[PDB]
Amino acid sequence: VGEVSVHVELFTHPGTGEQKVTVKVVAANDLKWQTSGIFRPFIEVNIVGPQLSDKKRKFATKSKNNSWAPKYNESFQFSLSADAGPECY
Amino acid sequence: ELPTFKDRVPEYPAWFEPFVIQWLDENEEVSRDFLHGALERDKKDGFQQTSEHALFSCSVVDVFSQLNQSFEIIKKLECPDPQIVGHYM
Amino acid sequence: ELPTFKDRVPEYPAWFEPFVIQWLDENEEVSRDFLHGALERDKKDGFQQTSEHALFSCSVVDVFSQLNQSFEIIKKLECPDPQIVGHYM
């Protein structure tokens, strides 16, 4: 229904040996959503995996008006657990 | 970085070239169908200038976005065979 | 106190943070203009010691006073996001 360009950097966090996940949301494209109104796309990013109760599971880009190919260039930083490896997420 | 293959233009891109070409084709069709969408939106909107300084209407932005997405994929391949690159280009 | 948001570091400080930074900016520039004024008032006072046992001159005091008035305006926000705090700091 479209696509999202992301650049993602796993950091086995050079400051801690936890894992942190930088997610640069670059853009979306080909969004199948030529809507009955003002389209205002934004991109939610969520991390999924174990031990996330204490952590910010969700981010979102700003919205972009009337844009089926919205650029964002917005960089988020999830924390994973320390224990569960990146393959648990 | 092994001497044995720093001594060569890498041969592996020649394996993938037919697939990248097929992808470039698919991408052209997707681009030309996206274009008609982008234009039909803009035309139905009566070609509003994107803003009072973006003197052009939105379909330009859509189209170049599509093209740029398309280009950036190719560019990220960084194909080390300049003849395969010339062919892609 | 709703469980849903007791579960979380409040996200609202991310909203205000740019306006706080703007404030910190207005504040610094005011503080640097103030600094020059204070130094110059003290210079006009020939840089007398604040007393014969308070061996520095008054501009030092004025500046720390200002910096503290300023810091306290920040501190009075008690932003529950410590990274947004870290940014202010």
How would you concisely characterize the structure shown here?
Chain A: This is Protein unc-13 homolog A. Chain A is an all-beta fold.
What does it look like?
- This is part of a larger assembly, with 3 copies of chain A (89 residues).
- Chain A has strands at residues 3-12, 19-29, 44-46, 58-60, 71-79.
- Chain A is built from no helices and 5 strands.
- Chain A is elongated, with a radius of gyration of 15 Å.
- Chain A is an all-beta fold.
- The interface between A and B is small, with 11 and 12 residues.
- It is classed as exocytosis.
Task: Note the overall shape of chain A.
Answer: elongated
Oligomer: part of a larger assembly
- Figure out the total of helices of chain A: 0
Strand order of the largest sheet of chain A: 1-2-5
Rounded Rg of chain A? 15 Å
Specify the helix fraction band of chain A. under 10%
Strand percent estimate of chain A: 35-45%
- Strand segment count of chain A: 5
Largest interface: A-B, 11 and 12 residues
Order of helices and strands of chain A: EEEEE
Summing up helix and strand content along with how strands pair, one would put the structural category of chain A as: mainly beta
- Determine the N-to-C terminus distance of chain A: 24 Å
The biggest beta sheet of chain A is recorded as: 3 strands, antiparallel
Organism (chain A): Mus musculus (Mouse)
Protein name (chain A): Protein unc-13 homolog A
Subcellular location (chain A): Cytoplasm; Cell membrane; Presynaptic cell membrane; Presynaptic active zone
Domain C2 (chain A): 1-89
